From Swiss-Prot:
Binding site for adenosine: E171, N336, A360, H361
Gene for this chain: ADORA2A
SS bond partners: C73-C161, C76-C148, C79-C168, C342-C345
Subunit architecture: Interacts (via cytoplasmic C-terminal domain) with USP4; the interaction is direct. May interact with DRD4. Interacts with NECAB2. Interacts (via cytoplasmic C-terminal domain) with GAS2L2; interaction enhances receptor-mediated adenylyl cyclase activity.
Keywords: Cell membrane, Disulfide bond, G-protein coupled receptor, Glycoprotein, Membrane, Receptor, Transducer, Transmembrane, Transmembrane helix, Ubl conjugation
Cytoplasmic side, ranges: 35-44, 103-122, 201-317
Any one Gene Ontology cellular component term annotated for this protein: axolemma
Post-translational changes noted in the entry: Ubiquitinated. Deubiquitinated by USP4; leading to stabilization and expression at the cell surface.
Official protein name in the record: Adenosine receptor A2a
Topology versus the membrane: Multi-pass membrane protein
Residue range from the parent sequence: 2 to 305 of 412
UniProt-annotated location(s): Cell membrane
Organism: Homo sapiens
Chain ranges on the Extracellular side, renumbered to this chain: 4-9, 69-79, 146-175, 342-349
Transmembrane segments annotated in the record for this chain: 10-34, 45-68, 80-102, 123-145, 176-200, 318-341, 350-373
């Protein structure tokens, strides 16, 4: 058996490398939001809460994991605290990710009341509540659900520990039934699945809205053709009444309101002629609608489409971040499941525990990269911060 300081040297060096990069990248995220008012919105207050959690992974959770890798003698509840603290930060991350998903759902499903409903003041209070709940959930073992009543006395004596002390190792103090049923199933898997459901609803809502935009445009152009080849005033009137309802339905900024004003007025003009039995005059008046459509309506159509595509792009970036949290944390949770549910299976070997721990920690590095690669306003602010 090779000297343990050699393998732990590699593990510890990698942990420290991750801690440095987790602190630097997420400090940059927080600085960017602090400095750029275009980045100061409710979505990005949850982004900052998530960056703060990742900063604390570098400042506290990684030094704690390095300390625990030594198995040093410690009062059992002190060991328990440094072992559980990373769970607080993971839980807070989950609350932030779920809040971000819900925020984007509200923005796409009910844009007209988003600004009245989702305010910065309410967001700060939500963030404070979620941090309190993260402490309660992550430190729940400190309330008595722990293995400190059954210390491994042979291991403690072999290391020369003193009274009330244990060799400090995560699995000796944190119960695995808490880790699997309460932390993983209830507090991690369930929120991640709820997030998956929110994102499905976001993309379905976008796809449906971009469909309805295209439907109204098609109805407008189809009914223009119907009028042109109509044969009596009654047919002209039928198509015009559909167009009028569809115009108001698409009405639901000054040049925008002017263009629809023109449009509905021109439909009313032609409809009045059609009811008077003046087919040719009604058809000629309807042809004027094509001038309004080119100058105004199509511009509104293109801008509505472009706004929806930007909402889709923003939601995908947020979903990538949630998906990467899952990818990085799941191996460690799955290993706990094997330890717990398969007592006939040999425990995952030490090199694999190390690997799964640093994979989980690497998730605290990756978000600033996603923001830089996918969000212009962050990328340009990062550049100004780094340059200046
Ligand atoms: C505001 C921040 C920076 C302060 C951080 C304080 C941290 C480092 C403190 C808070 C409580 C402390 C623990 C409390 C009790 C014990 C039991 C002892 O047998 C070994 C040390 C150990 C495990 C301590 C390690 C350091 C510790 C985790
Ligand atoms: C911002 C400030 C107030 C942080 C407050 C955290 C304090 C109150 C908590 C955090 C961790 C706690 C320690 C965790 C574990 C142990 C080991 C146990 O054998 C005696 C108590 C002791 C030493 C606790 C004392 C209280 C403690 C230090
Ligand atoms: C989330 C995505 C990346 C899936 C990752 C799956 C990983 C975590 C899976 C795939 C194969 C699994 C291993 C397969 C067999 C064993 C041997 C057993 O005696 C201990 C657990 C152990 C070592 C498993 C640990 C978990 C494991 C490494
Ligand atoms: C997408 C979501 C649902 C991922 C969560 C799936 C998890 C909970 C699944 C993936 C593979 C599963 C493991 C596959 C094999 C075994 C070995 C068996 O002797 C006990 C159960 C155990 C250890 C399973 C426990 C549950 C498990 C870890
Ligand atoms: C302590 C642990 C981490 C510090 C993280 C603290 C993060 C604070 C950043 C403040 C910020 O960037 O937000 C300003 C806000 O947008 C103005 O309305
Ligand atoms: C011993 C271990 C103790 C370790 C310290 C505990 C840190 C706890 C919480 C930090 C939370 C910081 C959250 C910052 C979010 C900032 C934010 O989003 O601001 C919104 C803005 O104010 C809208 O108006
Ligand atoms: C700068 C960083 C220093 C980290 C120092 C960490 C020092 C930890 C000593 C290594 C050690 O004692 O490792 C125990 C090993 O697992 C045998 O069981
Ligand atoms: C800006 C600063 C922000 C705050 C920065 C916080 C840094 C915490 C660092 C390391 C935690 C190490 C955990 C404590 C290591 C314990 C070693 C020990 O206690 O030795 C006991 C042994 O039994 C002999 O008595
Ligand atoms: C803000 C910056 C925070 C400064 C504290 C930083 C690191 C603490 C390192 C932990 C030091 C642990 C030494 C433990 C030790 O020496 O243990 C001997 C053993 O108990 C037999 O005597
Ligand atoms: C906008 C500002 C957001 C930051 C908000 C501040 C963070 C709240 C920290 C609470 C620690 C105490 C909670 C203790 C609950 C569990 C304690 C325990 O279980 O031991
Ligand atoms: C939701 C908001 C958080 C509620 C906090 C109240 C928690 C009460 C503080 C619990 C004190 C923990 C304690 O001292 O428990 C020692 C016991 O021996 C266990 O092992
Ligand atoms: C969604 C996630 C909840 C998943 C529900 C999973 C319920 C698991 C029940 C179970 O695993 O049964 C215990 C087994 O007997 C072990 O000894
Ligand atoms: C389980 C998670 C697997 C990876 C998720 C991912 O990377 O994709 C992000 C998002 O779903 C893509 O739009
Ligand atoms: C999402 C959660 C869903 C399923 C996890 C269920 C895992 C249940 C594993 C049960 C394992 C078991 O029963 O082990 C018996 C042992 O092999 C002696 O025969
Ligand atoms: C590697 C050792 C065995 C030599 C020391 C040790 O016990 N290290 C350790 C640690 F510091 C943190 C965790 C941890 O965070 N596990 C989680 N599972 C799900 C969410 S967090 C697991 C660990 F094994
Ligand atoms: C990407 C995520 C990981 C980044 C870098 C990972 C590489 C190495 C860290 C794994 C530590 C392995 C320790 C081996 C020593 C041993 O077997 O005891
Ligand atoms: C542009 C560069 C950004 C800053 C770079 C900082 C580099 C820090 C990286 C790794 C720290 C490695 C220290 C290794 C000492 C551990 C010794 C041991 O295992 O006992
Ligand atoms: C991950 C690493 C990103 C680090 C890039 C350099 C930015 C650090 C400077 C700072 O904002 O404090
Ligand atoms: C290790 C570092 C731990 C904490 C780092 C947190 C830094 C994050 C964001 C910076 C925001 C502070 C606001 C100062 C504003 C000064 C100014 O506007 O001129
Ligand atoms: C920005 C400030 C961040 C804080 C710096 C702290 C980093 C130190 C890293 C690891 C601490 C390791 C704890 C030592 C274990 C003791 C081993 C033993 O006692 O047997
Ligand atoms: C704040 C920056 C941290 C300052 C110094 C890092 C040196 C920590 C020394 C390691 C002690 C652990 C040990 O002796 O085993
Ligand atoms: C440890 C398990 C979780 C604990 C469950 C119950 C603890 C807290 C419950 C609810 C917090 C709800 C916040 C409502 C505060 C009122 C704010 C307002 O004025 O509108
Ligand atoms: C590359 C990272 C590791 C890849 C896949 C994990 C599978 C390794 C299985 C190790 C089993 C060891 C054993 O139980 O004897
Ligand atoms: Na995180």
């Amino acid at each position: 058996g090779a000297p343990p300081i050699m393998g732990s040297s590699v593990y510890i060096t990698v942990e420290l490398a991750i801690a440095v990069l987790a602190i630097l990248g997420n400090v940059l995220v927080c600085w960017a939001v602090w400095l750029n008012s275009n980045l100061q919105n409710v979505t990005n207050y949850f982004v900052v809460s998530l960056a703060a959690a990742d900063i604390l992974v570098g400042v506290l959770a990684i030094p704690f994991a390095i300390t625990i890798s030594t198995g040093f003698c410690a009062a059992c509840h002190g060991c328990l605290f440094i072992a559980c603290f990373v769970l607080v930060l993971a839980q807070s991350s989950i609350f932030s990710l779920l809040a971000i998903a819900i925020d984007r759902y509200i923005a796409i499903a009910i844009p007209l009341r988003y600004n009245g409903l989702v305010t910065g003041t309410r967001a700060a209070g939500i963030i404070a509540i979620c941090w309190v709940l993260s402490f309660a959930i992550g430190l729940t073992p400190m309330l008595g659900w722990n293995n400190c009543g059954q210390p491994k006395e042979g291991k403690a004596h072999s290391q020369g520990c003193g009274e009330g002390q244990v060799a400090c190792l995560f699995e000796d103090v944190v119960p695995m039934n808490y880790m699997v049923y309460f932390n993983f199933f209830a507090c991690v898997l369930v929120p991640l699945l709820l997030m998956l459901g929110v994102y499905l609803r976001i993309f379905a809502a976008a796809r449906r809205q971009l469909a309805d935009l295209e439907d109204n445009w098609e109805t407008l152009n189809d009914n223009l053709k119907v009028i042109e080849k109509a044969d009596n005033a009654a047919q002209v009137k039928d198509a015009l009444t559909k167009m009028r309802a569809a115009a108001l339905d698409a009405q639901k900024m000054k040049d925008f309101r002017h263009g629809f004003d023109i449009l509905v007025g021109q439909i009313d003009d032609a409809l009045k002629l059609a009811n008077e039995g003046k087919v040719k005059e009604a058809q000629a008046a309807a042809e004027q609608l094509k001038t309004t459509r080119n100058a105004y309506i199509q511009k509104y159509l293109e801008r509505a489409r472009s706004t929806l595509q930007k909402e889709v792009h923003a939601a995908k970036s947020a979903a990538i971040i949630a998906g990467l949290f899952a990818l990085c944390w799941l191996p460690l949770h799955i290993i706990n499941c094997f330890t717990f549910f398969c007592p006939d299976c040999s425990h995952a070997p030490l090199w694999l525990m190390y690997l799964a721990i640093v994979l989980a920690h690497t998730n605290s590095v990756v978000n600033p990269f996603i923001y830089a690669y996918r969000i212009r306003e962050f990328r340009q602010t990062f550049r100004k911060i780094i340059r200046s």
